[PDB]
Design a protein around this ligand. Structure first.
Ligand SMILES: [Mg+2]
Ligand SMILES: [Mg+2]
Ligand SMILES: [Mg+2]
Ligand SMILES: [Mg+2]
Ligand SMILES: [Mg+2]
Ligand SMILES: [Mg+2]
Ligand SMILES: [Mg+2]
Ligand SMILES: [Mg+2]
Ligand SMILES: [Mg+2]
Ligand SMILES: [Mg+2]
Ligand SMILES: [Mg+2]
Ligand SMILES: [Mg+2]
Ligand SMILES: [Mg+2]
Ligand SMILES: [Mg+2]
Ligand SMILES: [Mg+2]
Ligand SMILES: [Mg+2]
Ligand SMILES: [Mg+2]
Ligand SMILES: [Mg+2]
Ligand SMILES: [Mg+2]
Ligand SMILES: [Mg+2]
Ligand SMILES: [Mg+2]
Ligand SMILES: [Mg+2]
Ligand SMILES: [Mg+2]
Ligand SMILES: [Mg+2]
Ligand SMILES: [Mg+2]
Ligand SMILES: [Mg+2]
Ligand SMILES: [Mg+2]
Ligand SMILES: [Mg+2]
Ligand SMILES: [Mg+2]
Ligand SMILES: [Mg+2]
Ligand SMILES: [Zn+2]
Lengths: 75, 98
RNA sequence: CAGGUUGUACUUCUUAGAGGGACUAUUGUGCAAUAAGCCAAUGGAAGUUUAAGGCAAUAACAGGUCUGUGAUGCCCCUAGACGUGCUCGGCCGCACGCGCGUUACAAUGACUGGCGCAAAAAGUAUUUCCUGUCCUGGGAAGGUACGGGUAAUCUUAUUAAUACCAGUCGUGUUAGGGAUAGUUCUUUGGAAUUGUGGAUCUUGAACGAGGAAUUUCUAGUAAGUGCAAGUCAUCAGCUUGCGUUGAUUAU
RNA sequence: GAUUAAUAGGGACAGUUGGGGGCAUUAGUAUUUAAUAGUCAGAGGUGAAAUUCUUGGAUUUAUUAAGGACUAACUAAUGCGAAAGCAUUUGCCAAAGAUGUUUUCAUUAAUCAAGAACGAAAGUUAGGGGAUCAAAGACGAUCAGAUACCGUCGUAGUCUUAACUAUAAACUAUACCGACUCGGGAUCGGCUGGAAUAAAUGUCCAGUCGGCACCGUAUGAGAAAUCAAAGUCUUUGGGUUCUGGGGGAAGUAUGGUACGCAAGUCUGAAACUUAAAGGAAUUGACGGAACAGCACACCAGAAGUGGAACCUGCGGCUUAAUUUGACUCAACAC
C-alpha cells in the first residue's frame, strides 16, 4: 500500500511528504498499530523525501466508557 | 492472613480514588493501584531509522524523528500476565525501584 | 611362485606380561573480578569426563517372586493323599481383540556360474564331544576305510554372508514372495501321527510399500549381512555375543 | 468578701492553606451525530471469521456545528472532608484545620440508650435529558453443550430536578478522649533564627507545633502472619460506648412486624443436625503460574512396526483339561 502510493506520487510530480501519524486515539489504544513503522519505512525506501513528522492520535481531555465494561475483554 | 501493607495501592489518606481503564483489557482499575510506566517510545526500530534518515527530506536540525509518547496504565490482572512485574519472592516484595 | 629344512638368528605381523602415554597439553577470542570454566585451531593412536560397560546413596513402590532354594510363619492335603510313580491326553485347542518379531512387495532386483577376504565363541570316560582325510549315495545322509585333539598344538589360521566379474530373465502379483497342501526319501528318539528337523517334484495364497497412530536411533553407531553361544536327543522365526559391508541429518 | 488559669475545653483576633461544600460562570479535547467540501472499494471486528456498514457513499482527510457526559498528561503511600466523598477557569455565599498569640471566658468538659443530620453504586415514584457504554433482549461465533467468558447491535439505567431507599470486603476488616515510653531522615500546612543570591507569595541551613506515610530496631506484645501499637495486662484496675460465646440450619424463615410506593432494611428464632468448623504457619504433592536447567524429549533426518503371510507371547471362547504368574512405562519370545 506504501510502494503503491509512491509510484502514483511520482506521477502527481510530488517527491516530499509530510506525515501525520495517528491510531484511533479516541478512547482506544492510543498506541500506533503495526503497519505503522512499516508504512513509513516503505515510503522512504522507495525514494520519497520526508517532510516534518507529527503524531496526531487524538488524545481526549475526559473520556467515555471504553470498549467492554467494568472488566473488559476477558480470555 | 495479610499479604501486603499497601495491598498493591497507594491510597493513604482519602477514602476513594478515581477509577481508570486498563491499557490492555480495558478493565476499570483504581488509579493508585494499577501499574504505570509512561514510556518514551521510538517511531521506528533501530536499523530502520537510518533508512528513513537518508531518504528524509525537510531540514536537519539533528532532531530526528519525533519520539512517540506512550502513557501506560495496566491493571494487575493483565499487567502480570503481560510480563510486566513478575511474582516476586517474600522479602523482595518491599523492594522499590530495583 | 608355491613346498621341505635349518639356525642356542630375529621380532614388524601374533601372543601377553612389565612400563610407557592424556592431564584436557600449546596458541588466541568469550567468560573474566581473580575464577571455575566454555570455544577454535595445531600436535596427536587417542581429546563428547577418549569410547563401551561394571559398580551403584537416603527413602520408597503394601512392585515381583513362598513354582529355584533342605530360607521359613500361618493355613491347607495325608494312603481310593495336593506324597510319590505309570499309561495316555494338554498346555500349540479357534469366530475373534492385543504385543514382540520373521519374510516381502522386486531390477539400487531374482536365478546360474566364478571368486584363497572375517570375528568370536565352543569341543570326550571306551565309538558316547569337535570332527579333518577317504568311500558310498541325485539328495538329505550314510560307512567305518585312514586320523588329530580332553587344545594358540586337533576340527583352523581355515567353510561365513552382504560385496565383486560373467551369464539368463526383462515388468509381466511373471514368481519377485514364498504361506497352504500332496505322495516319496532321510536323520533324533522306545514313540513323532495333533507334519521334531532335514531332501525331492509339484502345488503357489495375501503382498504392488501399508490409515489414526507409534518405537528405537548420531559413528565403524542406523541398516544390511551372515557366524557363534544358551536352551538342546532332536526343534529357532527368541536371547546373549561376533565380525563384514557401511551412509543421510544433527552437534 | 471572687485560688491558679489546667502542653483541658469555648469564644475574639491575625496573616495563610486545602481536588471541603453551595450558587454562578467558563473551557477543553474525545465520543456520537450533522452540515461543507475530498476521493475511492473497502471498512469494521477475531485467535481465525461471522452477522454488521458501504459507489441513494461507507470507513478516510480538512473546516465547522449540534449535543450529553467527562475532566486526561501534571496527579504522588501528596491535599481537604464526620463519613459516603472531593481534581478546567473565574466570581460570589456561609464554613473548617493547623499555626500565632503577655486577648478574654473561666469547667464550661469524655463518651453516649432515647432521639436526630448525613450515607458512591444499584434500585423506586413523577417530570426533564438522552452522547457513550451498557443488565434484560436480538443476533453472530465458540463449543459435545453456551440463552457464558470474544464479537454486532440494543432497552432500563448511567446525567438531572423533586421525592423515597440505607445497604456495601461503607476496610486500616484495629471505638472515642488521655499519659507514657526506641532511632532516623523525608514529607504537607503554619510559625521563629540564620546564609547566599537577591531583595523573589522563590532557594537553602536550623528549630518547632499540627497532618498523611515510610525506614531501622525491641531482654514489649502475639498462635503466628505480624504490631511503635495489635506495646505500658497474672507485676492481671486511667474514663466511656458497642459487640462475641463450637460449627451447619442462619441472618434464613406461614417468625417479629418498628421503617418502606417497591425491591428490602431493622430486629431475628426454634425444630433439626454434628467433632469438628475454624486461625496461622511447616513440609510435601499438584498448578490448563513466574525463573533456570537437563535427556533422540523435540528439533534435522534415517530405519521401521502399525497394513501382508507366517512365528511366538497375552486376552477371549472352547475343552475332559486346555498349569499358573505377571498387566501403564515398573505384563505379553518375560
Ligand atoms: Mg470506600
Ligand atoms: Mg563412563
Ligand atoms: Mg538399587
Ligand atoms: Mg522365593
Ligand atoms: Mg494319586
Ligand atoms: Mg560322516
Ligand atoms: Mg566349528
Ligand atoms: Mg526366468
Ligand atoms: Mg504326514
Ligand atoms: Mg516344515
Ligand atoms: Mg540378524
Ligand atoms: Mg549342538
Ligand atoms: Mg543352537
Ligand atoms: Mg470551590
Ligand atoms: Mg465499534
Ligand atoms: Mg463541542
Ligand atoms: Mg496537592
Ligand atoms: Mg486539568
Ligand atoms: Mg433521609
Ligand atoms: Mg425517567
Ligand atoms: Mg462444532
Ligand atoms: Mg455498542
Ligand atoms: Mg524566615
Ligand atoms: Mg524544615
Ligand atoms: Mg490477644
Ligand atoms: Mg515498624
Ligand atoms: Mg484485662
Ligand atoms: Mg426478613
Ligand atoms: Mg490457611
Ligand atoms: Mg492359554
Ligand atoms: Zn487488564
Amino acid at each position: 500500500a506504501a510502494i503503491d502510493v509512491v509510484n502514483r506520487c511520482k506521477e502527481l510530480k510530488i517527491n516530499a511528504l509530510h506525515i501525520k501519524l495517528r491510531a484511533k486515539g479516541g478512547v482506544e489504544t492510543k498506541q500506533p498499530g503495526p503497519g505503522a513503522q512499516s508504512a513509513l519505512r516503505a515510503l522512504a525506501r522507495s525514494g520519497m523525501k520526508i517532510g516534518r513528522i507529527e503524531d496526531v492520535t487524538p488524545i481526549p481531555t475526559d473520556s467515555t466508557r471504553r470498549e467492554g465494561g467494568r472488566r473488559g475483554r476477558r480470555l | 492472613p495479610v499479604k501486603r501493607r499497601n495491598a498493591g495501592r497507594s491510597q493513604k489518606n482519602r477514602g476513594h480514588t478515581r477509577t481508570v481503564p486498563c491499557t490492555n483489557c480495558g478493565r476499570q482499575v483504581a488509579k493508585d493501584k494499577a501499574v504505570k510506566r509512561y514510556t518514551v517510545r521510538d517511531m521506528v526500530d533501530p536499523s530502520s531509522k537510518r533508512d528513513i534518515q537518508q531518504k528524509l527530506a525537510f531540514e536537519n536540525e539533528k532532531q530526528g524523528i519525533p519520539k512517540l509518547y506512550v502513557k501506560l496504565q495496566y491493571c494487575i490482572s493483565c499487567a502480570i500476565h503481560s510480563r510486566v512485574v513478575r511474582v516476586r519472592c517474600a522479602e523482595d516484595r518491599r523492594i522499590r525501584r530495583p
